[PDB]
Design an enzyme around this catalytic site. Structure first.
Site, PDB file in Angstrom:
ATOM      1  N   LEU A 165      22.469   5.436 -12.312  1.00  0.00           N
ATOM      2  CA  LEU A 165      22.389   4.778 -11.012  1.00  0.00           C
ATOM      3  C   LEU A 165      23.767   4.461 -10.448  1.00  0.00           C
ATOM      4  O   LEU A 165      23.951   4.478  -9.226  1.00  0.00           O
ATOM      5  CB  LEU A 165      21.553   3.504 -11.120  1.00  0.00           C
ATOM      6  CG  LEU A 165      20.096   3.719 -11.528  1.00  0.00           C
ATOM      7  CD1 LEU A 165      19.348   2.400 -11.541  1.00  0.00           C
ATOM      8  CD2 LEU A 165      19.422   4.710 -10.594  1.00  0.00           C
ATOM      9  N   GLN A 187       0.821  -1.209   0.000  1.00  0.00           N
ATOM     10  CA  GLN A 187       0.000   0.000   0.000  1.00  0.00           C
ATOM     11  C   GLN A 187       0.856   1.260   0.000  1.00  0.00           C
ATOM     12  O   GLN A 187       0.579   2.206  -0.746  1.00  0.00           O
ATOM     13  CB  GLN A 187      -0.936  -0.003   1.208  1.00  0.00           C
ATOM     14  CG  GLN A 187      -1.611   1.335   1.473  1.00  0.00           C
ATOM     15  CD  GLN A 187      -2.578   1.279   2.638  1.00  0.00           C
ATOM     16  OE1 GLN A 187      -3.224   0.258   2.873  1.00  0.00           O
ATOM     17  NE2 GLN A 187      -2.679   2.378   3.378  1.00  0.00           N
ATOM     18  N   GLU A 237       5.645  -3.545  13.682  1.00  0.00           N
ATOM     19  CA  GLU A 237       6.407  -2.845  12.651  1.00  0.00           C
ATOM     20  C   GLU A 237       7.898  -2.740  12.964  1.00  0.00           C
ATOM     21  O   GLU A 237       8.699  -2.819  12.016  1.00  0.00           O
ATOM     22  CB  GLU A 237       5.804  -1.455  12.404  1.00  0.00           C
ATOM     23  CG  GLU A 237       4.441  -1.486  11.728  1.00  0.00           C
ATOM     24  CD  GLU A 237       4.064  -0.154  11.111  1.00  0.00           C
ATOM     25  OE1 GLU A 237       4.973   0.576  10.664  1.00  0.00           O
ATOM     26  OE2 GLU A 237       2.858   0.165  11.074  1.00  0.00           O
ATOM     27  N   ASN A 248       8.389   8.736   8.470  1.00  0.00           N
ATOM     28  CA  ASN A 248       7.032   9.270   8.469  1.00  0.00           C
ATOM     29  C   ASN A 248       6.849  10.356   9.521  1.00  0.00           C
ATOM     30  O   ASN A 248       6.042  11.270   9.328  1.00  0.00           O
ATOM     31  CB  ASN A 248       6.017   8.147   8.691  1.00  0.00           C
ATOM     32  CG  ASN A 248       5.424   7.631   7.396  1.00  0.00           C
ATOM     33  OD1 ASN A 248       5.445   8.316   6.373  1.00  0.00           O
ATOM     34  ND2 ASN A 248       4.882   6.419   7.434  1.00  0.00           N
ATOM     35  N   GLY A 262       5.468  -4.842   2.300  1.00  0.00           N
ATOM     36  CA  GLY A 262       6.585  -3.933   2.107  1.00  0.00           C
ATOM     37  C   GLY A 262       7.889  -4.425   2.694  1.00  0.00           C
ATOM     38  O   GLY A 262       8.959  -3.980   2.268  1.00  0.00           O
ATOM     39  N   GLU A 301      26.386   6.314 -10.653  1.00  0.00           N
ATOM     40  CA  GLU A 301      26.938   7.528 -10.059  1.00  0.00           C
ATOM     41  C   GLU A 301      26.333   7.810  -8.688  1.00  0.00           C
ATOM     42  O   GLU A 301      26.970   8.468  -7.857  1.00  0.00           O
ATOM     43  CB  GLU A 301      26.724   8.717 -10.995  1.00  0.00           C
ATOM     44  CG  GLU A 301      27.523   9.951 -10.617  1.00  0.00           C
ATOM     45  CD  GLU A 301      27.353  11.084 -11.607  1.00  0.00           C
ATOM     46  OE1 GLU A 301      26.971  10.812 -12.764  1.00  0.00           O
ATOM     47  OE2 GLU A 301      27.598  12.248 -11.226  1.00  0.00           O
ATOM     48  N   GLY A 306       5.013  -2.752   6.908  1.00  0.00           N
ATOM     49  CA  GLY A 306       4.036  -3.651   6.325  1.00  0.00           C
ATOM     50  C   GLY A 306       4.601  -5.038   6.081  1.00  0.00           C
ATOM     51  O   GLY A 306       5.803  -5.230   5.901  1.00  0.00           O
ATOM     52  N   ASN A 312       2.177  11.913   1.150  1.00  0.00           N
ATOM     53  CA  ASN A 312       2.647  11.384  -0.127  1.00  0.00           C
ATOM     54  C   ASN A 312       2.948  12.498  -1.122  1.00  0.00           C
ATOM     55  O   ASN A 312       3.889  12.386  -1.917  1.00  0.00           O
ATOM     56  CB  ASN A 312       1.619  10.412  -0.702  1.00  0.00           C
ATOM     57  CG  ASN A 312       1.512   9.134   0.107  1.00  0.00           C
ATOM     58  OD1 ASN A 312       2.100   9.017   1.183  1.00  0.00           O
ATOM     59  ND2 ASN A 312       0.757   8.170  -0.404  1.00  0.00           N
TER      60      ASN A 312
END
Ligand SMILES: Nc1nc2c(ncn2[C@@H]2O[C@H](COP(=O)(O)OP(=O)(O)OP(=O)(O)O)[C@@H](O)[C@H]2O)c(=O)[nH]1
Ligand SMILES: Nc1nc2c(ncn2[C@@H]2O[C@H](COP(=O)(O)OP(=O)(O)O)[C@@H](O)[C@H]2O)c(=O)[nH]1
Ligand SMILES: [Mg+2]
Lengths: 431, 431, 155
Positions: B246, B11, B177, B200, B140, B248, B137, B222
């Site tokens: 990427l 999510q 978490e 967060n 996640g 660098e 999550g 977000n």
């Protein structure tokens, strides 16, 4: 994680189970015939969780009705919502249990358990993605205690990856002075510590004290007691029936509330406490809802939270209120009563807000707590069990049905180990 | 060009990715249907092109439950993505690292790779992947760690960058978490080349302080996060000389492979209600890059030492004013580089002002800056996380949920011990 | 052996069978394997009529079994109020102590027989009587949080 299959067993289970369907159907806007008469899209967002969509615009409850006595079958149909229940989901035996845990668990109920499993499979396979089961019953009787725990074991061994939830009513001499109820309750708790994921302890001793001492009801009736039960069952299932966060499903709720697999017995709370049709409480604010939710007089279990320590706490607020104010009050109680929360579980308090309050109220708050103080309930049932068991009183009622005498001893040893387990983490420190 | 594939897991990864790709289109001038008018390549690293002129993002959206991705399948930019790159299961990981990695994650891990392979075969020179996910999550953490292992086997020489969401009790959803954040860090530490952590709590406090948002939601967080992710990936999508690929990113920000967690600071953040604010100078926004209040992770770089520092300006920025700002900052502030690194500041300037999303909370600015730095002060973020892990794991709280889903209890110890070694990696560098 | 038949007749509540067996010389004070007399079983299963006819035929109202249980202990435990008043009427020891240190007041307080608690107090139940763990009837009310039982013991 969507549909949930409801099962109600015994006299108490069907009484509190019928009230549960009467309350939530009024919240979702469902008439006794099943037609949607509401005026809010949130009422049909999570309606598939507890209902099945019929041919027309009719919603049928996903409920299974079991009992050994045929008399309660007539009582359910006599209710205002007796016609919305599925006639295929009615399973009633010939003779009752007679307040004997062995008849429902080993003899009379063991013959009727196969007919219920066939209804469970027929209801479970029609769900697009089954989430779990919820059971409403008592522990002092014979069917809801004896067959109720048997049905849990048979269903769990067929649906092991699902969630098993129970709303168990604890016996109390204040309401029913049947001396063999501590027998049936202890034998049931021996099963609940092994075969259930979440168990809400609805203590009749607390329900009687609330009606008698707080509600000023000198002669409390089962209707007065079930009024507290239906209001509590509707609150704990608010987020299972409305677009919510916090948990939203049974497994996420269990992960955030059960730190130890044996300690899954919850202490329900509710505020405000009103009578039947009284409509007395009105001027109730956010600071007062948070105050009463953590008070001993608002607990549905005869246990003082001040005597133990909280492991996990879940609160569900209902009504139009300020998210900022709810957050300021919840943090204030956690700081004011910090000695009543364990320090080795950081952020053990989950807060919820729902915009749809129950019927007849604008402000509401439901408390779900996993507290070590729940041992005072188990030590109360154990003391009554030991007083009876040491005299071998009425032991032939159970052994005559096939039970071994060691089943009482091993059941007496489990709950004592359960009490010692609550006291273990109540005195543990982080150091 | 050298293409880049962005992967959004869970999510948190999906909703943040939805806000990022909305911002990417408004920066490049791409309509929600993928059409871009006759604009004059560099933008092709993030967008492929069909025969009809449709610009489709090189992105994959994965989640074990369909609720969040179904919003993308029907949202404003629903016609932008390939429908076959929006992959959804039916039952999520229930905030359990073990479910996302061992049990539930295995049932869809092969389908995600075959869909990623389809985008890989479309590329003429694929350089790596961008992985968006949360730490708390179950998907996640568990599914992301599973996906990162598979990408290292099938894509050996390809880079892998992370945009990870650090848990904060203000907008957190699970008590376990801290567990999942430690488990996913240990298993992904060797498979990730550079990880940009987003705290967060830092983004939460910035919205309340600078944007005057009393109770920020996921929407407010977000939009600000996507505004910062854009400034980090702007060098890959536009012309420039700093962090053009990427590889660098690793050369400039990561001196040693295990300490690949750069700190990001953004300025200025001004509420949209102050549309007639004064345009801050280059020196004002550069000094704001060293205040702890503007950092994406709560820590104090004054308490640590610097190993790398990059400055990515956007808008009306004269290079001579940047050098004068660095010379002042070099002598004014207490900025200590390590004894084994050059104390220089890398500067890249994009002369376009940042693009704001209609409906956002940020006002238009003529110049903005995003500083990417690798300081030992970010070990404070790991220290707060390790403390919450040790408090619960000492009593083995919630451990049965993990060991019941294929995971073994020994993995808890090897992951925590790896964090202790990672904490000493920062101490051995800067004491 | 008519003693074994009188034991079973007192359990099932057969008033006619008890009167006939006593007419043929059955031992009113016979005991089972655990030391239960016909007065024990009649008072346990709530057969008031059999308790009355036994007490009028030489039944020992203060007999104890192997574990020291008197008929008043079992009547106060199961909750037969009418039987308790009959036993006390025939000289039952209100403060008899069994092998666990429990008195009839302890058992009635534990099982929540509030009306029986008041009758025992009116007949001279010892509120200071401790069991094997030092708990009195008032201690059990406090530890269990029974406020109605606590106020009854405070008069
Ligand atoms: N910034 C931001 N954080 C989010 C968002 N959604 C979730 N999170 C964070 O992610 C953490 C939980 O992880 P989720 O992404 O929601 O869970 P998941 O990846 O779907 O995995 P499951 O457990 O299976 O649901 C929480 O700490 C949230 O604060 C979001 O939209 N924006
Ligand atoms: N709160 C509440 N408790 C009840 C109700 N009906 C019965 N009980 C309790 O349930 C116990 C009796 O068990 P019961 O369910 O009737 O026996 P069963 O039919 O074999 O399940 C008693 O201790 C009662 O206090 C009710 O309507 N409400
Ligand atoms: Mg999810």
């Amino acid at each position: 994680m969507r549909e949930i299959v409801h099962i109600q067993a015994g006299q108490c289970g069907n009484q509190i189970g019928a009230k549960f369907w009467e309350v939530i159907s009024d919240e979702h806007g469902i008439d006794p015939t099943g037609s949607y008469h509401g005026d809010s899209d949130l009422q049909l967002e999570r309606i598939n969780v507890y209902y099945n969509e019929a041919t027309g615009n009719k919603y049928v409850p996903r409920a299974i009705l079991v009992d050994l006595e045929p008399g309660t079958m007539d009582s359910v149909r006599s209710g205002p919502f007796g016609q919305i229940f599925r006639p295929d989901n009615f399973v009633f035996g010939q003779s009752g249990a007679g307040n004997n845990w062995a008849k429902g668990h080993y003899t009379e109920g063991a013959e009727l358990v196969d007919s219920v499993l066939d209804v469970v499979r027929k209801e479970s396979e029609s769900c697009d993605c089954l989430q779990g089961f919820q059971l409403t019953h008592s522990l002092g009787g014979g069917t809801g205690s004896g067959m109720g725990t048997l049905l849990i074991s048979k269903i769990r061994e067929e649906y092991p990856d699902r969630i098993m939830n129970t709303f168990s009513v604890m016996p109390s001499p204040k309401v029913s002075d049947t001396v063999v109820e501590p027998y049936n309750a202890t034998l049931s708790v021996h099963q609940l510590v092994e075969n259930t994921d979440e168990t809400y302890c609805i203590d009749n001793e607390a329900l009687y004290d609330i009606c008698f001492r707080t509600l000023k009801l000198t002669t409390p009736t089962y209707g007065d007691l079930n009024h507290l039960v239906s209001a509590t069952m509707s609150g704990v299932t608010t987020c299972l029936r409305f677009p919510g966060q916090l948990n939203a499903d049974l497994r996420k709720l269990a992960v955030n509330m059960v730190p130890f697999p044996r300690l899954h017995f919850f202490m329900p709370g509710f505020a405000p406490l009103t009578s039947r049709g009284s409509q007395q409480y009105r001027a109730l604010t956010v600071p007062e809802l948070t105050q009463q939710m953590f008070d001993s007089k608002n607990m549905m279990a005869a246990c003082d939270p001040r005597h133990g320590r909280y492991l996990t706490v879940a609160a569900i607020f209902r009504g139009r209120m300020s998210m900022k104010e709810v957050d300021e009050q919840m943090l204030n109680v956690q700081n004011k009563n910090s000695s009543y929360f364990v320090e080795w579980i950081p952020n053990n308090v989950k807060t919820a807000v729902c915009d749809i309050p129950p019927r007849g109220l604008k402000m509401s708050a439901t408390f779900i707590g996993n507290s070590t103080a729940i041992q005072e309930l188990f030590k109360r049932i154990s003391e009554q069990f030991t007083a009876m068991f040491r005299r071998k009183a009425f032991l032939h009622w159970y052994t005559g049905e096939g039970m071994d005498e060691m089943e009482f001893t091993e059941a007496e040893s489990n709950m004592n180990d359960l009490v010692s387990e609550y006291q273990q983490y109540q005195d543990a420190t982080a150091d | 060009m050298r293409e880049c594939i962005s992967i959004h897991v869970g999510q948190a990864g999906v909703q943040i990715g939805n806000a990022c790709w909305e911002l990417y289109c408004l920066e490049h001038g791409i309509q929600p249907d993928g059409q871009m008018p006759s604009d004059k390549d560099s933008f092709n690293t993030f967008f492929s092109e069909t025969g009809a002129g449709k610009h489709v993002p090189r992105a994959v959206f994965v989640d074990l439950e369909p609720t969040v991705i179904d919003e993308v399948r029907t949202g404003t930019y629903r016609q932008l993505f390939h429908p076959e790159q929006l992959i959804t299961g039916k039952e999520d990981a229930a905030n359990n690292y073990a479910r996302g990695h061992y049990t539930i994650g295995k049932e869809i891990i092969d389908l995600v790779l075959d869909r990623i392979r389809k985008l890989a075969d479309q590329c003429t020179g694929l350089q790596g992947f961008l992985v968006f996910h949360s730490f708390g999550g179950g998907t996640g953490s568990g599914f992301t760690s599973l996906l990162m292992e598979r990408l290292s086997v099938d894509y050996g020489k390809k880079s892998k960058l992370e945009f990870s969401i650090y848990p904060a009790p203000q907008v957190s959803t699970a008590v376990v978490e801290p567990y999942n954040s430690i488990l996913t860090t240990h298993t992904t530490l060797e498979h990730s080349d550079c990880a940009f952590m987003v705290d967060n709590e830092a983004i939460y406090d910035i919205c309340r302080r600078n944007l005057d948002i009393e109770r920020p939601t996921y929407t407010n967080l977000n939009r600000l996060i996507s505004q910062i992710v854009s400034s980090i990936t702007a060098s890959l999508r536009f012309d420039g000389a700093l962090n053009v690929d990427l590889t660098e990113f690793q050369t400039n920000l990561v001196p040693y492979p295990r300490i690949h967690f750069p700190l990001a600071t953004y300025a200025p953040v001004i509420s949209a209600e102050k549309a007639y604010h004064e345009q801050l100078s280059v020196a004002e926004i550069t000094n704001a890059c060293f205040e702890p209040a503007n950092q994406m992770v709560k820590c104090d770089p004054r308490h640590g030492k610097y190993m790398a520092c990059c400055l990515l300006y956007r808008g009306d920025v004269v290079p001579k004013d940047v050098n004068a700002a660095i010379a002042t900052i070099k002598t004014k502030r207490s900025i200590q580089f390590v004894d084994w690194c050059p104390t220089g500041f890398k500067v890249g300037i994009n002369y376009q002002p940042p693009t704001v999303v209609p409906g956002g909370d940020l006002a238009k600015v003529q110049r903005a800056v995003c500083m990417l730095s690798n300081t030992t002060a970010i070990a404070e973020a790991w220290a707060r996380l390790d403390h919450k892990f040790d408090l619960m794991y000492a009593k083995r709280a919630f451990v049965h949920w993990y060991v019941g889903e294929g995971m073994e209890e020994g993995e808890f110890s090897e992951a925590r011990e790896d964090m202790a070694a990672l904490e000493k990696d920062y101490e051995e560098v800067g004491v | 052996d008519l003693g074994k038949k009188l034991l079973e007749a007192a359990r099932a509540g057969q008033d006619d069978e008890v009167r006939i067996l006593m007419a043929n010389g059955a031992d009113v004070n016979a005991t089972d394997a655990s030391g239960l007399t016909p007065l024990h079983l009649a008072a346990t299963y709530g057969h008031l009529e059999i308790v009355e006819v036994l007490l009028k035929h030489g039944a020992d109202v203060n007999a104890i079994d192997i574990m020291g249980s008197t008929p008043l202990h079992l009547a106060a435990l199961i909750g037969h109020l009418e039987i308790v008043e009959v036993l006390l009427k025939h000289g039952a020891d209100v403060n008899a102590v069994d092998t666990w240190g429990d008195t009839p007041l302890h058992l009635a307080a534990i099982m929540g027989h509030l009306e029986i608690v008041e009758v025992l107090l009116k007949h001279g139940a010892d509120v200071n009587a401790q069991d094997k763990f030092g708990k009195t009837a008032f201690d059990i009310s406090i530890d269990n949080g029974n406020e109605d039982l606590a106020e009854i013991l405070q008069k």
